[PDB]
Amino acid sequence: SGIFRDVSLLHKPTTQISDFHVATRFNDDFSRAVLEAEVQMCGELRDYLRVTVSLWQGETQVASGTAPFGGEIIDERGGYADRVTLRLNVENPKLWSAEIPNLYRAVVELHTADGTLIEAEACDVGFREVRIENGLLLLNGKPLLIRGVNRHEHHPLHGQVMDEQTMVQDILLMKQNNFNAVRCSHYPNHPLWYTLCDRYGLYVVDEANIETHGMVPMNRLTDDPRWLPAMSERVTRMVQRDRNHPSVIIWSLGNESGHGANHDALYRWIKSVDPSRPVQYEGGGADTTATDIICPMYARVDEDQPFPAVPKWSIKKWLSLPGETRPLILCEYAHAAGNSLGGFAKYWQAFRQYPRLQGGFVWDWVDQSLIKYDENGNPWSAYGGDFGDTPNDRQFCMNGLVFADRTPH
Amino acid sequence: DEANIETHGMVPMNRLTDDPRWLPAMSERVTRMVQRDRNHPSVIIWSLGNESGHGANHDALYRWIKSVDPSRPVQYEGGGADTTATDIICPMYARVDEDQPFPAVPKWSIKKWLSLPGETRPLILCEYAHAAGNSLGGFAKYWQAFRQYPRLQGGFVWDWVDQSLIKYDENGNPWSAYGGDFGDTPNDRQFCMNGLVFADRTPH
Numbered sequence: 001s002g003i004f005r006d007v008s009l010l011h012k013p014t015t016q017i018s019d020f021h022v023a024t025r026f027n028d029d030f031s032r033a034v035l036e037a038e039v040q041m042c043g044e045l046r047d048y049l050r051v052t053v054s055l056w057q058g059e060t061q062v063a064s065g066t067a068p069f070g071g072e073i074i075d076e077r078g079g080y081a082d083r084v085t086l087r088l089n090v091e092n093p094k095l096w097s098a099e100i101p102n103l104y105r106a107v108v109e110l111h112t113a114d115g116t117l118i119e120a121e122a123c124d125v126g127f128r129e130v131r132i133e134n135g136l137l138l139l140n141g142k143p144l145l146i147r148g149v150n151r152h153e154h155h156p157l158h159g160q161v162m163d164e165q166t167m168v169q170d171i172l173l174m175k176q177n178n179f180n181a182v183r184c185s186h187y188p189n190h191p192l193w194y195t196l197c198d199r200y201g202l203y204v205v206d207e208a209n210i211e212t213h214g215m216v217p218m219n220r221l222t223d224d225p226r227w228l229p230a231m232s233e234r235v236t237r238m239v240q241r242d243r244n245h246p247s248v249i250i251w252s253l254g255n256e257s258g259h260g261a262n263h264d265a266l267y268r269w270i271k272s273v274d275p276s277r278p279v280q281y282e283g284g285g286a287d288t289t290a291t292d293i294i295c296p297m298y299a300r301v302d303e304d305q306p307f308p309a310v311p312k313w314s315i316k317k318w319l320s321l322p323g324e325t326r327p328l329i330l331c332e333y334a335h336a337a338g339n340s341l342g343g344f345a346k347y348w349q350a351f352r353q354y355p356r357l358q359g360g361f362v363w364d365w366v367d368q369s370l371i372k373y374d375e376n377g378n379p380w381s382a383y384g385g386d387f388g389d390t391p392n393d394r395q396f397c398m399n400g401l402v403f404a405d406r407t408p409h
Numbered sequence: 410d411e412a413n414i415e416t417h418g419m420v421p422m423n424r425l426t427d428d429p430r431w432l433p434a435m436s437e438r439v440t441r442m443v444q445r446d447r448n449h450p451s452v453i454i455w456s457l458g459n460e461s462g463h464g465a466n467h468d469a470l471y472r473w474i475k476s477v478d479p480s481r482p483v484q485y486e487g488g489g490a491d492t493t494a495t496d497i498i499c500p501m502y503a504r505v506d507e508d509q510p511f512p513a514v515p516k517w518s519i520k521k522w523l524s525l526p527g528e529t530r531p532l533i534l535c536e537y538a539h540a541a542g543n544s545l546g547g548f549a550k551y552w553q554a555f556r557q558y559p560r561l562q563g564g565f566v567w568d569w570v571d572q573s574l575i576k577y578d579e580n581g582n583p584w585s586a587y588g589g590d591f592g593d594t595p596n597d598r599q600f601c602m603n604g605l606v607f608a609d610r611t612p613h
């Protein structure tokens with residue numbers, strides 16, 4: 001507990017940019033694209049106010065558009081006088097992917113007609129399309145093969161406080177070891193994480209901070225309408241914060257909270273506000289109506305585990321169950337506790353042979369060990385129970401591919 | 410119940426079945442079969458024939474059957490075992506786990522075939538486990554898969570009885586003969602024998 005992430009002060013003019021969404025649509029062969037930027041303001045509306053959105057590729061300006069506030073008619077009462085949408089055409093856009101993280105820069109300027117700048121905001125833009133078609137998750141029209149890993153925010157000395165150096169180190173080790181994707185298990189990450197994934201090139205599953213694993217049954221709270229408000233804020237505020245990051249290609253409703261009606265409601269909310277990304281959730285069987293992707297945890301390659309209500313079918317078998325058509329990507333697999341990863345090759349042989357088996361996220365990146373000091377001041381790796389904490393789950397906090405100090409297992 | 414239509418020797422296999430001039434002769438082989446056997450409860454599936462590639466004639470006759478008798482599914486293996494002329498994925502000799510990516514007409518692992526993007530049909534092999542002589546090795550691998558996968562609904566072994574004929578030596582003693590033993594040439598020798606039982610129905 002504590003104030004474990006940055007604290008800052010931001011000054012904004014009274015007449016300000018209060019929000020902006022960036023989207024990129026493409027033609028059939030991705031040779032042409034349109035960047036659509038919806039900008040919202042707060043403060044006093046004036047006819048002389050203007051919004052200019054310009055797009056840059058390095059020091060080269062690719063496009064720019066300007067317009068006064070006033071959106072198209074929405075319903076019987078009119079439209080949003082405090083909003084405006086700019087549309088910019090881009091020919092032969094340099095596409096974003098984990099393979100080639102091409103990025104453009106969108107600058108959003110709030111200014112007066114006479115040319116006086118009031119304030120400017122901006123973001124890195126990655127031109128890419130994410131969509132599920134005919135049962136396959138596609139990125140820019142091509143079927144992905146997720147070489148991912150689950151990554152908790154953990155530091156042996158600083159606990160859950162993240163720093164740029166540690167983030168960069170994790171990303172480099174990941175790419176150097178052929179990983180192209182990461183799942184934010186199981187909450188929105190430090191804001192710099194997304195910036196680094198955008199620039200270095202890694203596919204990200206952004207996950208809502210919702211896990212009620214300890215409830216009995218697991219969905220006791222998620223199926224309770226009285227908890228819908230609290231859950232909704234965890235999902236909606238995540239989307240409102242990270243929707244402009246190209247690295248985020250999939251939204252997750254959380255983790256191990258069973259399957260409740262609140263999940264279906266929030267699943268639809270996301271699909272409604274942001275159709276550019278698929279939504280996944282593993283709770284309640286990995287294939288409920290709240291997930292566009294069959295995303296089981298620890299389902300085996302050939303062996304079925306027919307648990308009542310929430311069976312873990314062999315992944316090859318899962319795909320062809322009567323009426324099933326969705327792609328399958330394990331949100332968690334290959335538990336790396338100590339001397340582990342036996343049978344890892346079996347998953348990959350299957351991933352490569354089956355089009356709809358599009359990978360998974362290994363569990364997990366780093367051991368959650370903490371440093372303690374003996375009588376002589378010598379440091380040692382501690383785990384559950386070493387702090388007098390009880391009850392505890394001892395060494396179960398250590399199942400990463402690398403030690404806490406980032407040394408490889 | 411399978412229509413008497415096989416043009417295996419043509420090159421390519423669908424040279425005649427894709428030719429509208431052979432539609433008449435083909436249609437009678439399908440239509441007259443249905444007209445004769447449609448009241449038999451034992452018949453649960455209609456087949457358009459065997460190894461004749463996939464031609465437009467197949468699509469036309471497939472529809473004709475669906476139209477006149479919607480009580481039974483229609484299947485046909487030609488042209489890849491999963492064409493628009495079959496309600497059932499019915500390959501011949503597709504293996505359990507191993508793919509055989511032949512050009513145009515691949516024989517995918519049956520487990521993999523089921524989940525190909527957009528595929529939803531059941532899979533029943535019209536032919537599998539070739540029983541030529543000392544054979545049927547790996548037979549249990551098919552059954553383990555049939556039982557685990559709901560949509561893998563079995564298949565038909567190839568085949569029931571050796572097609573050997575009887576001949577008599579100088580002493581009048583009979584012996585089992587195969588291709589070529591009658592002066593017939595060209596011939597495909599012992600290939601006419603791959604049944605689970607000998608011609609006299611003695612079990613292999």
Ligand code: NA
Nearest residue numbers: 351354355357
């Ligand atoms: Na695959």
Ligand code: NA
Nearest residue numbers: 396397398399
């Ligand atoms: Na663990």
Ligand code: NA
Nearest residue numbers: 555558559561
């Ligand atoms: Na079956």
Ligand code: NA
Nearest residue numbers: 600601602603
């Ligand atoms: Na034969």
